[PDB]
Amino acid sequence: ISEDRINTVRGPITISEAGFTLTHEHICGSSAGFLRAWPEFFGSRAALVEKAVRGLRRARAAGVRTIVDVSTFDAGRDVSLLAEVSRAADVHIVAATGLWEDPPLSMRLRSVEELTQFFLREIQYGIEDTGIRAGIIKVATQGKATPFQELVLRAAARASLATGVPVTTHTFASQRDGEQQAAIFESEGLSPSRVCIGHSDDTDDLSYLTALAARGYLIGLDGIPHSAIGLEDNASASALLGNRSWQTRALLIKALIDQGYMKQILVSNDWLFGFSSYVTNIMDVMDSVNPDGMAFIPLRVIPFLREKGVPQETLAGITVTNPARFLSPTLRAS
Amino acid sequence: DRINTVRGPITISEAGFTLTHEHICGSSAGFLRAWPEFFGSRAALVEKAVRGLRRARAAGVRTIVDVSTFDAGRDVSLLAEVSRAADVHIVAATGLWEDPPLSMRLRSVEELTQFFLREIQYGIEDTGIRAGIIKVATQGKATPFQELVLRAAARASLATGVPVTTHTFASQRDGEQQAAIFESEGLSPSRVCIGHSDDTDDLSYLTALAARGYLIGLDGIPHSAIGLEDNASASALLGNRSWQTRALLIKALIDQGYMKQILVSNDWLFGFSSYVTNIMDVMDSVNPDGMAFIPLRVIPFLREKGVPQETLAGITVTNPARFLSPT
Ligand SMILES: C[C@H](CCC(=O)O)C(=O)O
Ligand SMILES: C[C@H](CCC(=O)O)C(=O)O
Ligand SMILES: [Zn+2]
Ligand SMILES: [Zn+2]
Ligand SMILES: [Zn+2]
Ligand SMILES: [Zn+2]
């Protein structure tokens, strides 16, 4: 019959309003303060807003209703930008706290207790002076965790336990980062069902993925359209996007389904509409690869899996119900 | 004719007593806006900075140069608020310091030049406040990116006439490599201040640079961990040389004929998030005078050593005016 609230950049929404949800996206992958200090890098702020609003309208027309922007502070998350484009496009956006790959000195020097207070601040009080409350915590490793990355993982688990909001991660999938991340989260008493091990489609190792899924972890197959096939002459695009086909990444979805782990899958594009933390031309290159942007999951991956025999009701469970269970906050500890 | 401040243009004569290397708040890009509770509160930091700038003004300071860059967390709206409430001019900086984010580290020399020019000619962020100085940094031998920054800083200075000021590892003689790269871009040494030079006692390093026309920034005079020997983190940052030892370098350079190329400052700050958590309280406990330390302590110390008042006015008033006035 019933087919609690999630915080978005426009306020609370019910779990039913979330609908088709892309769990790992970015409006703009940047650096803290950068969009405000140098909007001309993106053409203009107004150009970036219009480009993002068109992109979100394209995804909405394909059925997307919510995206989770997993841009942290140090990824240059600007929640006022997310709020504006969410209003104009009528697509819900969940904002993130946490820390990504590029913390500044003022973060890198902090204690696990201090990082915990920062993450709690952005969840419980709001981000900057906007009142917008984060609905997920993003963390990152790139191989074995640095000492600071450990602190971030522990502060994230402690913030998650105190607030009920879930944790999503960036991995070097080929290095099986998810195993160490899981070990640290579990040492903090975090439930695996509140953790998504992200960028897991970057690897073909199914024994690694199914082992985490069997432990209750969510498996983020979140970069399906990332591929430099056809751009072999472009070293920067090839290093970023990899030489594995979108079809190859997509078949991991079906492989997890066939092995019984449908309930552990999350799917996304890991797209963006501006991109300043890499080489200068990279957004233009990615847009030439995938004009559909965030609409790639519903317009290309769903019809692909449907013809391989995956039932629509299974795909709806992965893209609607699974994110809903992920993002719905659990009870606060104590 | 005019110098750009966070309140707008001023004439050269309005600058008066000027501290050439200071910080309202040493932080990181976006950090003050995202986590102001680190400093108690934004209002508390404002209040602390206004009280400190008002004391410096009562001691005779009329202008400070805030050499906080984008990546040092410069918030020009904070600078504008505290300058207005303390009636002390503040000159804002562009350039890049020792903590550039990916979106900066990945940029070309041409792109960096455009960014520095924007903050000088157009304004910082959406405030309309234009930078009046370019800040650069090395910590020993320059990284490849730091070489780009020095070159972009030189090109921006040439296009606008605003001067360049540097962070050095003085005991590795960084000013020499900085001078080499600047001169390879055609930049005039008289447009360059080699900063943190009071961090070394090697006077021959300093005088060779000055004999080439450079300005020498003796800018951390009150930095000292004397009495804090059981504090490893303060000792590493502040050093174990006394403020008297740093101040004697001012007299030494005067005695060697370089009084017209000395720039003096405190390198102080009212908030400090880019180091260990307690560091601002520790620094305040050893120098409560803050930015008023130069006029309240260093001026009387030098006058007792026999430096005449006209020499001290030339260093604190005439030199900064000549340096900041765009060419
Ligand atoms: C598009 C994505 C944004 C950053 C991230 O997901 O780590 C990428 O660069 O891989
Ligand atoms: C006090 C000074 C502020 C930053 C700078 O001058 O490099 C420091 O942290 O060394
Ligand atoms: Zn990532
Ligand atoms: Zn991402
Ligand atoms: Zn410095
Ligand atoms: Zn400084």
Author numbering:
A (entry chain B): 26 to 28, 35 to 365
B (entry chain A): 35 to 361
The authors write:
The enzyme phospho­triesterase (PTE) is capable of hydrolyzing such OP compounds. Accordingly, it has been characterized from a number of bacterial sources, including Brevundimonas diminuta (Bd; formerly Pseudomonas diminuta), Flavobacterium spp. and Agrobacterium radiobacter. The present study focuses on Bd_PTE, a dimeric metallohydrolase that has a (β/α)8 TIM-barrel fold with two Zn2+ ions embedded in the active site. Carbon dioxide reacts with the side chain of Lys169 to form a carbamate functional group within the active site, which serves as a bridging ligand to the α-Zn2+ and β-Zn2+ ions, both of which are required for full catalytic activity. The buried α-Zn2+ ion is ligated to the protein via direct interactions with His55, His57 and Asp301, and the exposed β-Zn2+ ion interacts with His201 and His230.
Interestingly, the crystal structure of A53_2 has a monomer in the asymmetric unit and the dimer is formed through a crystallographic twofold axis in space group P43212, as observed in the structures of several other PTEs: A53_5, C23_2, C23_3, C23_4, C23_5, C23M_1 and C23M_2. However, A53_3 and A53_4 crystallize in space group P21 with a dimer in the asymmetric unit. The presence of the octapeptide in the active site might be expected to interfere with the binding of OPs. This indeed explains why no OPs were found in crystals of A53_3 and A53_4. In these cases, no water molecules are directly bound to the Zn2+ ions, since the PAA monomer, i.e. acrylic acid (AA), is detected in the active site. The bound AA acts as a ligand to bridge the two Zn2+ metal ions, mimicking the tetrahedral intermediate formed during the hydrolysis of carboxylate esters and OPs. Furthermore, in addition to AA, the A53_4 active site also contains the octapeptide, which is exclusively observed in space group P21 (as described in Section 3.3). This suggests that the crystallization reagent PAA initially binds to the active site of PTE in solution. Subsequently, the octapeptide spacer 26ISEFITNS33 penetrates the active site during crystal formation in space group P21. Since no electron density for the co-crystallized OP ligands was observed in any PTE variants crystallized from PAA, the latter may have a higher affinity for the Zn2+ ions than the OPs.
